[model samples]
Target: MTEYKLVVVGAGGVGKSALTIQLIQNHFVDEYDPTIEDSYRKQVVIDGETCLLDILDTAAQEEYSAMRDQYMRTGEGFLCVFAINNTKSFEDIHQYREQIKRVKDSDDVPMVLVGNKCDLAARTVESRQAQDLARSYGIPYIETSAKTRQGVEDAFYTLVREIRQH
Candidate 1:
């Protein structure tokens, strides 16, 4: 029994919240700062029907690691965001899945590795290499930019589809 659950999100200010806005408003923002938890609900028309996206941004919780089980505990699927311009973000992806597993237990949870900020000098974080990591880990990978709003929906759609397939 698969429910059309669409909970998703992004950062490193990595322009992460901007990613959600780019999806919700189709407008890439200039200079942003949201230092705490936030909510974004976009009634999207995906899968040939009206879908729901409850994209909650909790990246800043890194500042205070409080009540995070609430975020990871219920999210049916995950899109682990990594900034393309910053290679270290790619390494950070490993740490996330473990926690996701920590909460989800033994279910092969739906998770995607996303490369963001790829609108420029992309090599700092090569897409192929990132895909390679995803390949070795046996998960799907995607690339996009909030600046161009390109592939934003593709990222979200795939997450939903992956969640569906699982």
Candidate 2:
């Protein structure tokens, strides 16, 4: 009963893999392959709720998006990600957000607006900008660095906290 269906979504090159990989693997690794996609199931204690987290990280490539809607239909909560340094990636976040919004079609669903690549000094999406976007959806905004491992747990665990009460 403690398992949560979580999805990580972002434009390619936004560190989607790096963020999730760091959380479950403890280090940042760069990778790209059309033949491979991944899901992660890790058990952890988040805010006193010991949970088995089911993470679908399927947005790392363009070819895989055919399956995006299929898995997204089953995803209970979402980690909507964007790269701090790329405005194009941040702009692409809207498509994913709106897609999930329409798919779920609910007033409020568990989601976090995640700004990854905070380790990079140049940022296209600033803190207040992200905070404001999250505020519009009434969700938490978290910044994470996949290399430094900053806010990795916070991003995923915050979504867990949002998901349980539903």
Candidate 3:
């Protein structure tokens, strides 16, 4: 199989794992259990595609500092996520970029900006603002919802398509 890696990350309660389950399995977890401590890996098989998807999901708050780089180095690219309802989580994306750069050996990796929880835009803090920010970086943005499946598969599929084409 032509396997590709995608790093899924964001602050705690940002729905990183929720998106992972919904995209790969088409289901959502209603309760936030907070079981994942630092990081974890998931494998998914998709039809009509000659590839295996290795998605890595990380905790918002972690054990150690150096582990961030350690997690980033294992990916082919990124699915940088943020909670649309939380302004601090959206702003902390700078840390996410810095953390990725810290571990990655190359500056050419592709990243898709995922503004998750679009199902609750009434609680949205900075979706359009974040979309503009991602556009400034020339990255595509997906307003996603793990609860309603809005733009869910489109986010991962679109990122995979772009990276594979390049």
Each prediction's whole-model lDDT (CA): 0.72, 0.82, 0.75
lDDT of 2 by residue, 25-80 (tens): 89878674523457888999877768798888875544546556666788889999
Worst window of 10 by summed lDDT in candidate 1: 1-10
Clashing pairs in 1: none
> Tens-digit lDDT track for model 1 on 1-166?
2344443434465666777789888898876676656667767676686777777666663453444456567677788788888877777777767767777895388877888887877358788888898887678898888898877888878888887778
User: Between the candidate structures 2 and 3, which one is better when assessed by lDDT?
Assistant: 2
Question: Best candidate per lDDT, number?
Answer: 2
Question: Can you give the TM-score per candidate against the true fold?
Answer: 0.86, 0.90, 0.83
Stretches of candidate 3 off by over 4 Å are 37-48, 60-71
* Candidate 1: stretches off by over 4 Å: 1-11, 61-68
Give the C-alpha miss distance for residue 68 in model 2, angstroms: 3.9
Candidate 3: TM-score?
0.83
Q: Pick the candidate with the highest TM-score.
A: 2
> What would the TM-score be for candidate 1 when compared with the true structure?
0.86
What is the alpha-carbon lDDT of model 1 when measured against the actual structure?
A: 0.72
Distance from true location, Cα of 122 in model 2, Å: 2.3
Model 2 residue 45 lDDT? 81
